[PDB]
Amino acid sequence: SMASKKVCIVGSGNWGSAIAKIVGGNAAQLAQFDPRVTMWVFEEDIGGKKLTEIINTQHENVKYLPGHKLPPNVVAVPDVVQAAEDADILIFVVPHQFIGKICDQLKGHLKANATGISLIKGVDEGPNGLKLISEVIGERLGIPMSVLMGANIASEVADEKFCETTIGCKDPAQGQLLKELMQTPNFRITVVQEVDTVEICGALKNVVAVGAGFCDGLGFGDNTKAAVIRLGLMEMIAFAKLFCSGPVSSATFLESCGVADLITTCYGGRNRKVAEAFARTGKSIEQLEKELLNGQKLQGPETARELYSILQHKGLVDKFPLFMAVYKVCYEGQPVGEFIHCLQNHPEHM
Ligand SMILES: NC(=O)c1ccc[n+]([C@@H]2O[C@H](COP(=O)([O-])OP(=O)(O)OC[C@H]3O[C@@H](n4cnc5c(N)ncnc54)[C@H](O)[C@@H]3O)[C@@H](O)[C@H]2O)c1
């Protein structure tokens, strides 16, 4: 009758810490999961103290998730290999820029039948086209992979406000097991099988949200923001269908990972906040990230840069106006006030 699976949370930021509240509590409540939940924490010096000691002592990662405690059973562990050594389930939740290295170090040190689920929002590019982050993680570490994507602003999740998420998993058994580990009476999960489409949604919505922030930065309102979300979704489906392997069904975009995450993000996401300030101050995105997010990371612009690269290697840049408009305003120096023009001209269908 099975042993309890050990869970390792790789990452500890805003979303990561919020996910630890959920997981820490479920592992502690459910026999199937070992109560000892480890969390890899990239060590930091917070006023002389090591962040890993603060967490294991005060059970709170206030720098990244203020006003919330973490279940006492979540252990902070600075060495990622150690944190992951005995894990059966590995939740990958860290900003895009950091997984490669993490994977460099875990390769070959994971338990035999370990599996993983990625919560990361973004995309890489492969020797030939789009390469999903879960695929990258899955191939380097040699483990089966799932993805958890939905409209989940962390602060709200941490506050237990009602919300849902989508888990993409090909294996039914695993799909249900991961759902038992993540579901809360306020964190409702639907499991679907096209991992790819679900993941890509999480990645592309952040680019759209940068655009929404620009329009807020130009003084627009809801009718405009809705347009931006609608046109962004039109580009997302079209883009998913072109570059994703296997069938891409529009129905999947009606899941939380799609229309919902696109909405919540465009209204209260970090990408929207920094995007608006970019529109108002003219400062660099990098500078705004440092000045405004107290250490948290942006994914929207870097993702747009990735899209640019994927699209240009196929001379299809002219095909995704809204996406490319976000990229040009962030990186080429195109005046933000010109953003509206890409909406006014946007193709009616794609
Ligand atoms: N925050 C959210 O609301 C929310 C909701 C759903 C998905 N996500 C996604 O979750 C993923 C994880 O993001 P997050 O929000 O937990 O974090 P952050 O984006 O909150 O924090 C940056 C984090 O990265 C780490 N970091 C900084 N420099 C590092 C380095 N040099 N090496 C290794 N780590 C370093 C720190 O440990 C810190 O916790 C992201 O892809 C994001 O888009 C976030």
Residue 62 maps to which CATH number?
3.40.50.720
Angle at which helices 270-281 and 285-292 cross, to 10°: 120
Q: Is there a binding annotation on residue 13?
A: yes
Is the minimum distance from the CB of 16 to ligand 1 under 6 angstroms?
yes
Kindly list the catalytic residues.
205
Question: Do 167 and 25 belong to one domain?
Answer: yes
- The type of residue at 65 is L
Question: Do 46 and 85 belong to one domain?
Answer: yes
Q: Is there a binding annotation on residue 299?
A: yes
Among 193, 215, 236, where does a domain finish? Answer: 193
Is the minimum distance from the CB of 346 to ligand 1 under 6 angstroms?
no
Residue 300 maps to which CATH number?
1.10.1040.10
> What's the structural domain count of the chain?
2
Q: Output Rg (C-alpha) for the chain, integer angstroms.
A: 20
Residue 99 Cα to ligand 1 midpoint, Å, equals: 11
Alpha-carbon gap, residue 121 to 149, rounded angstroms: 8
- Token representation of residue 152: 């989940």
Q: Is there a binding annotation on residue 16?
A: yes
Residue 165, helix vs strand vs coil: strand
Is the minimum distance from the CB of 121 to ligand 1 under 6 angstroms?
yes
CB 7, CB 91: distance < 8 Å: yes
Alpha-carbon gap, residue 194 to 222, rounded angstroms: 32
Which residue, by CA, sits nearest to atom 38 of ligand 1?
13
Question: Do 11 and 124 belong to one domain?
Answer: yes
The technique is X-ray
Question: Do 17 and 124 belong to one domain?
Answer: yes
The boundaries of the domain holding residue 82 are 1-193
Q: Alpha helix locations (H) across 11-126?
A: 14-29, 51-58, 80-84, 99-106
Question: Do 324 and 347 belong to one domain?
Answer: yes
Question: Do 180 and 252 belong to one domain?
Answer: no
Residue 337 Cα to ligand 1 midpoint, Å, equals: 30
Alpha-carbon gap, residue 278 to 144, rounded angstroms: 39
Which residue, by CA, sits nearest to atom 28 of ligand 1?
42
Resolution (A): 2.8
Residue 171 φ then ψ, to 5°? -90, 115
Strands (E), the chain: 7-10, 37-40, 45-46, 49-50, 74-77, 89-92, 115-118, 124-126, 129-131, 145-149, 163-168, 187-192
Q: Per this entry, what is the length of the chain? A: 350
- Token representation of residue 97: 């820029």
Is the minimum distance from the CB of 150 to ligand 1 under 6 angstroms?
no
